[PDB]
Amino acid sequence: ASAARRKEQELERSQEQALREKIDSVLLPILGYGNYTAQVDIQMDFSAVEQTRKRFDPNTPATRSEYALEDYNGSVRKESTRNFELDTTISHERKQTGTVARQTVSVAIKDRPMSESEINAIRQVLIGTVGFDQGRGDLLNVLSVKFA
Amino acid sequence: ASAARRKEQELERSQEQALREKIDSVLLPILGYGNYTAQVDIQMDFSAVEQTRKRFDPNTPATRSEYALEDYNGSVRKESTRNFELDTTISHERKQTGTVARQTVSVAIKDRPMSESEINAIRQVLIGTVGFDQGRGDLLNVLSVKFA
Amino acid sequence: ASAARRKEQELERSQEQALREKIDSVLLPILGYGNYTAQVDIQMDFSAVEQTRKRFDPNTPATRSEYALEDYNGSVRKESTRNFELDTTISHERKQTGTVARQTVSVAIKDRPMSESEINAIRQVLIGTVGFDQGRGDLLNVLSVKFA
Amino acid sequence: ASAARRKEQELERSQEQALREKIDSVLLPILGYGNYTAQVDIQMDFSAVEQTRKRFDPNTPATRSEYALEDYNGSVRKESTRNFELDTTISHERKQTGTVARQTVSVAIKDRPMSESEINAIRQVLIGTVGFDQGRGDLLNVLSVKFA
């Protein structure tokens, strides 16, 4: 199984490399060659979830058989027996093993600095270039630093 | 199964490449060569959902057999027994494995900037060029940036 | 099994080496050659967790059969029998063996010192370069020291 | 099995050697060649823990069947029978055999002494260079001594 773990590491590294390639394909025309640096971290879960759900519909029952005895005298006896049929959904789901659980991307732009408007524009391009998903916990940093 | 995961990555990359090709086929005449850059992120779910639904119709029962005893004296006894037949739908669905769960497209247009009207027109063309589906969670960014 | 433990050590060392390579790929342009030193510690758990969860939904029961006797005279007898159907989820999860439980990264920058703003900018780049995850217990130190 | 114990000793020594190599890779640029000495002690547990946990959820029961008799006359009789369904988690964990239970690192720096600020900076670099974990019981000593 350790060979499987090794190949999982290979998958994660391949994903990171592909994302880096896309980042380059976007930023190389916009910024130029050597005016930026970017690295990508991709964390992938490899669990084996397998779920079975059996759901009913309480608010729409359908009476199948029914008995109702109601006699008076004073005495009032109200017996009743009822059988129901209910909407039944049975869903069996099997999640894919390797899923990107969190994605971290950081891009540093060489100074000569960059204005806030262009930094936010680059961030907007990257959002969509990488597939930024904040609800997944992903993080995207864009900074303007001084290259040596 | 890790080979299957590798081929799933290949499928996702192929989808992204096809969408990029369509984006180019639309924008190359409109904008020109080298006046734009665009990248596409496609996230695909590969679950194995398999659902079985059994639904009834509570509001239209059909009486199959019926017994009704109603005697008086004062004393009033009202016995009743009833059997019903109901509309029964049984649907077994099996979803396709790989489905595009979210799609992100970002396009950056070289300045010399672009007016808001033409930006929105390009966005309208892309909506339909790519098959934008906001209800799916898809995202489409169109920006006017300064190429270096 | 000790061979398996040896290969687990190899996996941990490989992960550390990959993270060091990424750190170099980010900092070598920004800082230069020989102006920094960085080391990475990665602790990986290799447990064999395997969980089975059976969850219900108490607040949405669906009555399947029902009996209700209610007679008066004074005397008031209220008998009742009820059978329910409940939403039932059965999920079997099998965690991946080797998972990064804690990650420690330390970077030391050669003086001639570095201002706090640039130190924090480098820290921001590293956050995303390495995939910093404070909730996991990870730690990232960036210091400005005097190289001999 | 004594051969297994011998190989466990080999594993511990290999871990110590790797940590020493990392310590050198960090301190050799910062301090220089022959200006420091450091040794590492790693204690590793090799137990064979294997745990099975069966946990319930007392505060969210779901009633499956129910009987309730409540008659009056004075006399008040309240009989009741109830069956419940509970959330059931069954997790089987199998810990990895060899785990670092305690780690001790000591570093001695040649005088001409070292200021407290630089000693603490070196300590901060080592924390992260080695993966210092105080909650595990690890210990890290950094001293400035006079080499002969």
Partner: peptide, 17 residues
């Protein structure tokens, strides 16, 4: 274990339906 086997049997019931 037993619960996982019950889940598999429920999935088989789904497939049969």
């Amino acid at each position: 274990v037993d619960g996982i086997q019950a889940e598999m049997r429920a999935m088989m019931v789904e497939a049969t339906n």
